[PDB]
């Protein structure tokens, strides 16, 4: 039978880490070969795979290539996807012996050297496309604003290059793209600052140590995080010291990794009619030392697929014979023929070569620290991220948040104690109006001259103005939304303090003329004093009208929020010191006449109200707290008011 010297050589020593398992898949492929031999399908092909476990020593592979040429017979093509270094060697070798061949195994998008990968090919490649699945996630996990980092191993560096590649048409906010070498906690902070909500990393299972470490540091185990990686970062690495072994498992929990979908889910009669179930049965079993090297599925796949393209070009060559040498450039043309023809309903999947690209899907698991829910496999056909429904072990129902939160508004009022407050304020003002109607409507025994004289009803009126204007501007609490934009409640407080200072100056000029006569009609002069008060008042009123205390403030809040509301004027303390001075103007004469000696207690209550205004400034520094503070302020205000009323009520007792 016309033998088939095949370039059946790859790094497969027992020392060769998976290369041992490579031999562990050799037998299987050999079995496949034996199967093919059992098939004897493309006789007279007597498949003489010129075989050499290349043992992975770069120089060993060198001398291999060497003898392969010199001593080695007319072998066929790339038993490969083994040793990235010597891979590259082959990459160079691509057209070497007028050469051309293909592995299919390694994801090393180093393979991308279509320049070099002109005269060579491969199928199982870099899962950067998982981005699309991730896009599917961006669909399914419903995110569009994400950042990531990597321990940029020259691979993982190249991987991040591929990531940038994936950022092609990235119709979603690549909310960041960090990276790392070892500075996990450092980047951990950096990215907590990047509003940690989701995470993908290219790092060593080794590097994974510090990874999980910085993780448990942040530990933002919620929609404030996401775990994304690959079994490339070694299998059982989580199964494989800073973080809590608890928090370690926590990281392993929900750990969203992914790798190749090892084989066809429908474990049916393969494209080779092999019940892929029975296929794998025999695989593990006859394998008899393991299940074959992780590519076991892809391993025997490539076996049969070599065979496939083999029979394909076998037809294409029956078109023409077995005398090909390395000189046979036309045979290389026929190779390119079967190469363009690298496409079929491959067993593991309708294995075609989308620019050499394996036609497949990729298992995607969310490790719940052992529940590696390999739910998803982007059927590269559609990259149809076939997810095992309900396999989701999602912390919340949160499909990946895209760096979002919640606007926490400030505003703080009870509106009922405040309703009760407005009620009581109206009550005080109304009782004031009533008692005044009495005192005037009953002002016939105008029996006070050489005392608080019988004309103090005017002062009572000034007090009524005070207390009413107070009721209003205090009832100016929390729903100004009608205007709430320098809503002229400025003028509310303005008229408030106006009536206030009016009532104040009433007793002021009273005691003024009083102590004056006490040394050794004047209603006009007192009215003049109050008028000058109101004059400076309207002056500063226009002044702050130029300032023109829309309710605006600022704060962040939790349950995540941000508070902002307060009325503050352009005169940050200018008008403030102004009011302070206006007040001291009275408080002085107050304490003065207090020393001079009825209305002394009135001046006392006034100074009390001054201390109250101080507390109000404090509340301005202070929320609904400050709201109740203003409430208590108005309370003390009406309190001094009724206190004044009680002095008159003494006469009602006399009455």
């Amino acid at each position: 039978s016309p033998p088939l010297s095949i370039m059946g050589l790859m790094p497969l020593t027992k020392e060769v880490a998976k290369g041992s398992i490579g031999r562990g898949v050799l037998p299987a492929v050999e079995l496949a070969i034996e199967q093919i031999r059992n098939e004897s399908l493309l006789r007279p092909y007597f498949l003489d795979l010129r075989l050499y476990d290349t043992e992975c020593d770069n120089a060993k592979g060198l001398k291999a290539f060497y003898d392969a040429i010199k001593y080695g017979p007319n072998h066929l093509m790339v038993f490969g996807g083994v040793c990235p270094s010597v891979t590259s060697i082959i990459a160079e070798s691509l057209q070497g012996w007028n050469l051309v061949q293909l592995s299919f195994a390694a994801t090393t998008p180093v393979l991308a050297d279509k320049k070099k990968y002109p005269y060579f090919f491969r199928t199982v490649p870099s899962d950067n496309a998982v981005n699309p699945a991730i896009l599917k996630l961006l669909k399914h996990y419903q995110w569009k604003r994400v950042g990531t980092l990597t321990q940029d191993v020259q691979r993982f560096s190249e991987v991040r290059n591929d990531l940038t590649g994936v950022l092609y048409g990235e119709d979603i906010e690549i909310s960041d793209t960090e990276s790392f070498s070892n500075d996990p906690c450092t980047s951990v902070k950096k990215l907590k600052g990047n509003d940690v909500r989701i995470i993908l990393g290219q790092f060593d299972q080794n590097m994974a140590a510090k990874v999980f470490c910085c993780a448990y540091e942040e530990n933002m185990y919620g929609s404030k995080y996401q775990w994304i990686i690959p079994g490339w970062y070694e299998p059982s690495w989580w199964e494989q010291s800073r973080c809590l072994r608890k928090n370690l498992l926590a990281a392993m929990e929900g750990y969203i990794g992914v790798d190749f979908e090892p084989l066809s889910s429908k474990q049916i009669k393969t494209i080779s009619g092999k019940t892929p179930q029975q296929y794998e049965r025999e695989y593990n079993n006859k394998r008899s030392g393991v299940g074959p090297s992780k590519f076991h599925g892809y391993a025997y796949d490539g076996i049969w697929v070599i065979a496939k393209t083999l029979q394909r070009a076998m037809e294409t060559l029956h078109a023409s014979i077995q005398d090909f040498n390395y000189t046979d450039h036309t045979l290389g043309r026929i190779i390119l023929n079967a190469m363009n023809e690298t496409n079929f309903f491959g067993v593991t999947g309708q294995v075609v070569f989308r620019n050499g690209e394996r036609m497949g899907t990729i298992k995607f698991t969310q490790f719940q620290d052992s529940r590696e829910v390999k739910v998803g496999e982007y059927n590269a056909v559609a990259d149809t991220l076939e997810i095992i429904n309900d396999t989701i072990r999602f912390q919340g129902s949160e499909p990946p948040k895209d760096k979002t939160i919640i606007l926490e508004q400030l505003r703080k009022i009870s509106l009922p104690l405040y309703s009760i407050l407005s009620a009581l304020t109206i009550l005080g003002m109304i009782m004031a109006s009533a008692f005044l109607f009495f005192n005037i409507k009953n002002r016939n025994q105008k029996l006070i001259k050489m005392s608080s004289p019988y004309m103090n009803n005017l002062i009572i009126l000034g007090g009524m103005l005070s207390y009413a204007s107070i009721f209003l501007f205090g009832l100016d609490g929390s729903f100004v939304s009608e205007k709430t934009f320098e809503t002229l409640c400025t003028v509310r407080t303005w008229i408030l303090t106006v009536g206030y200072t009016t009532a104040f100056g009433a007793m002021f000029a009273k005691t003024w003329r009083v102590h004056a006569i006490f040394k050794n009609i004047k209603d006009q002069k007192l009215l003049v004093i109050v008028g000058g008060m109101l004059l400076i008042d309207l002056c500063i009123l226009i002044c702050w009208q130029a300032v023109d205390r829309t309710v605006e403030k600022y704060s962040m809040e939790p349950s995540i929020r941000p508070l902002l509301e307060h009325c503050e004027n352009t005169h940050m303390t200018i008008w403030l010191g102004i009011v302070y001075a206006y007040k001291g103007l009275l408080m002085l004469f107050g304490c003065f006449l207090a020393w001079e000696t009825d209305s002394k207690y009135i001046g006392m209550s006034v100074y009390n109200v001054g201390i109250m205004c101080i507390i109000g400034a404090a509340v301005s520094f202070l929320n609904v707290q400050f709201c109740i503070v203003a409430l208590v302020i108005i309370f003390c205000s009406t309190i001094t008011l009724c206190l004044v009323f009680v002095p008159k009520l003494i006469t009602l007792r006399t009455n």
């Binding site: 770069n58 120089a59 001398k63 290539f65 060497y66 040429i69 160079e92 057209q95 070497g96 003065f592």
Partner: protein
């Protein structure tokens, strides 16, 4: 002896970065042939100069290579200058284990001593030059490193070597930027990175786009720094490209003085070679073999290293001065030559044949800022010491190799104003004050026929005046102003002002009894003033808590950088500030008490006095004291005029009444 043709592993980079030495190879081979001719030293073999064209066919090159490995005879070495495929074979050697022979690869790639076992290539990283450039930085006094690079894998290796040196340097790697294609963005970032000490790495055309970006930024100044090396060509700078858009004039201007260099790329002098050839005669022979355009002379300067390597092979030969029993394996003579390699170092005519750690060359390094674009190679780093012959052609920052981190700002840490008018009026006031004190004392000691029978209040008046004088001394110009003694003075100053404030309100004490007289013995007003002093001591403890006053101030810049730490001065906890506000509150209390009420004329004087005190309160409130250098001490004169009115009262009719 017997010129047994030794299989000489030769594939010329017929295509190559400089695929013209590929020819010069033959010429160097000619030289070698000349050597093979002048085999007198040890003719005991010839070269089976297995000649091929490297031809940049990297993969196919390697194919033919193997073919040679697959071919006779027992071969010698590499015909390499550039790495990639060579580098591959270099990794490969041990398997066959032959002479790692490039020359024109400074490639940090050379460093893989593990892999780079047989390494042999003249070109070496100018990082040492960079380190010499560090020395030059030293010669610049530069110690703060700002750099970037179009991230060539070359420039990658660079960035490493950079980092290598920077570590070895232990100098401030002030900035490590980079580039890939057009970092004009990162250029603006460097603007943001606040350019003072600049260097970058790219290729003549990458360099072209670079200079384009440069002229764009136009940030040319002693801030900017065109620190470079001879990776590109002069014309690559000097000649302009149509693909550009910037101002070849402006950019040209920028190009001048651009710092760069190149090692001594050939025999500097024309001495008779190791082959008794003049470097002149070298260039002669160059021209001789120059059968094509000397313009088209690829590896022209390299051809120097080429025939050099010819002679160098010859050196190893005459060292060995048959042993052919080596295979790609058989390692006896292999190790023999390996020793000869550990022994490989000489004095070649191109330069004292210098084996770097990996045998690479080493010699003086011409060093040329693009001196008016006539890059004056004013340095020659004798790699032995990298001893830069500093020919000092520097047309540079000051004409000068200035230092890195070009920024040196001032600070207005204080001021004095000479206290000129200040200290003047200060001495004047102290004089008049002591004068009035003695005058009243003379008026004192004998009288009873005045308002009462004792000017005990004159004492508290003098106390306030003493406070005034003391503060003139205390917060004057002898604690951080004219006199330079703060480290103690400022320290001692912590007390000075404080002390004086004590006597402040002394004279006002009478008011209390006057208030009592407003009601209308000495124990009453005595206890009153005692309580005043007690409040004073309370605030003094508050200050002792609120201490550390002689403090820093105040942020500002200045106009050769300038800053203004404007007048670092008395500054402590504003708690004591509020305490002073409270003291002034008590004062205003006294003020109103006066507003209430001879002794009446005395009280009117005291009213004017409280008015002056109110004035002083503003200067207090003028603590802002923007022009503090022109603000303080008006209140001292206030106190002066106050005590003046006091004595004016106490003088004439007071004598008439009390004494005479």
């Amino acid at each position: 002896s017997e010129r047994r043709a030794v299989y000489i592993g030769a594939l010329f980079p017929m295509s190559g970065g400089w695929p013209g030495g590929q020819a010069c190879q033959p010429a160097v081979e000619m030289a070698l042939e000349d050597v093979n001719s002048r085999r007198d030293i040890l003719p005991d073999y010839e070269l089976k100069l297995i000649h091929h064209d490297s031809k940049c066919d990297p993969g196919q090159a390697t194919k033919y290579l193997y073919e040679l490995l697959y071919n006779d005879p027992i071969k010698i070495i590499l015909m390499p200058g550039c790495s990639s495929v060579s580098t591959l074979v270099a990794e490969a050697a041990r398997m066959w284990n032959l002479i790692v022979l490039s020359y024109g690869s400074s490639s940090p790639a050379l460093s893989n001593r593990q892999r780079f076992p047989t390494f042999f290539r003249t070109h070496p990283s100018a990082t040492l030059h960079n380190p010499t450039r560090v020395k030059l930085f030293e010669k610049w006094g530069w110690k703060k490193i700002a750099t970037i690079q179009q991230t060539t894998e070359v420039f990658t290796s660079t960035l490493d070597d950079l980092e290598e040196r920077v570590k070895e340097a232990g100098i401030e790697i002030t900035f490590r930027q980079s580039f890939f294609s057009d970092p004009a963005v990162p250029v603006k970032n460097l603007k943001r990175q606040d350019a003072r000490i600049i260097v970058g790495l790219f290729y003549e055309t990458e360099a072209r786009k670079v200079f384009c970006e440069v002229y764009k930024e136009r940030l040319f100044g002693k801030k900017y720094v065109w620190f470079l090396i001879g990776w590109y060509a002069d014309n690559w700078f000097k000649i302009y490209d149509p693909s550009i858009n910037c101002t070849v004039d402006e950019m040209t201007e920028a190009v001048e003085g651009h710092i760069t260099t190149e090692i001594v790329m050939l025999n500097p002098a024309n001495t008779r070679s190791i082959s008794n050839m003049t470097s002149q005669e070298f260039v002669e022979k160059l021209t001789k073999r120059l059968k094509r355009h000397p313009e088209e002379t690829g590896g022209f300067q390299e051809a120097p290293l080429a025939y050099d390597a010819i002679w160098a092979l010859a050196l190893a030969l005459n060292k060995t001065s048959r042993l052919e029993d080596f295979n790609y394996n058989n390692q006896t003579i292999t190790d023999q030559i390996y020793r000869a390699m550990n022994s490989s170092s000489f004095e070649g005519v191109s330069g004292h044949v210098v084996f770097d750690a990996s045998g690479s060359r080493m010699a003086w390094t011409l060093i040329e800022q693009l001196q008016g674009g006539s890059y004056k190679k004013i340095g020659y780093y004798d790699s032995t010491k990298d001893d830069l012959s500093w020919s000092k052609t520097d047309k540079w920052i000051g004409g000068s190799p200035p230092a890195d981190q070009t920024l040196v700002i001032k600070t207005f840490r204080f001021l004095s104003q000479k206290l000129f008018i200040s200290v003047s009026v200060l001495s004047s006031l102290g004089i008049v004050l002591a004068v009035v004190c003695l005058s009243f004392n003379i008026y004192n000691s004998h009288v009873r026929y005045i308002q009462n029978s004792q000017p005990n209040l004159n004492n508290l008046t003098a106390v306030g005046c003493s406070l005034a004088l003391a503060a003139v001394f205390p917060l004057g110009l002898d604690g951080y102003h004219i006199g330079r003694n703060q480290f103690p003075f400022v320290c001692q100053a912590r007390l000075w002002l404080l002390g004086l404030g004590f006597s402040l309100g002394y004279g006002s004490m009478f008011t209390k009894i006057w208030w009592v007289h407003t009601v209308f013995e000495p124990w009453k007003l005595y206890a009153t003033v005692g309580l005043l002093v007690g409040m004073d001591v309370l605030t003094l403890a508050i200050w002792q808590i609120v201490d550390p006053l002689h403090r820093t101030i105040e942020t500002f810049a200045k106009e050769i950088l300038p800053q203004l730490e404007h007048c670092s001065s008395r500054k402590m906890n504003t708690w004591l500030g509020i305490f002073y506000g409270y003291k002034g509150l008590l004062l205003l209390l006294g003020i109103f008490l006066a507003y209430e009420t001879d002794h009446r004329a005395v009280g009117m004087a005291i009213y004017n006095v409280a008015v002056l005190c109110l004035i002083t309160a503003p200067v207090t409130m003028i603590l802002s004291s923007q022009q503090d250098a022109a603000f303080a001490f008006a209140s001292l004169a206030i106190v002066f005029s106050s005590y003046i009115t006091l004595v004016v009262l106490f003088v004439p009719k007071m004598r008439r009444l009390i004494t005479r």
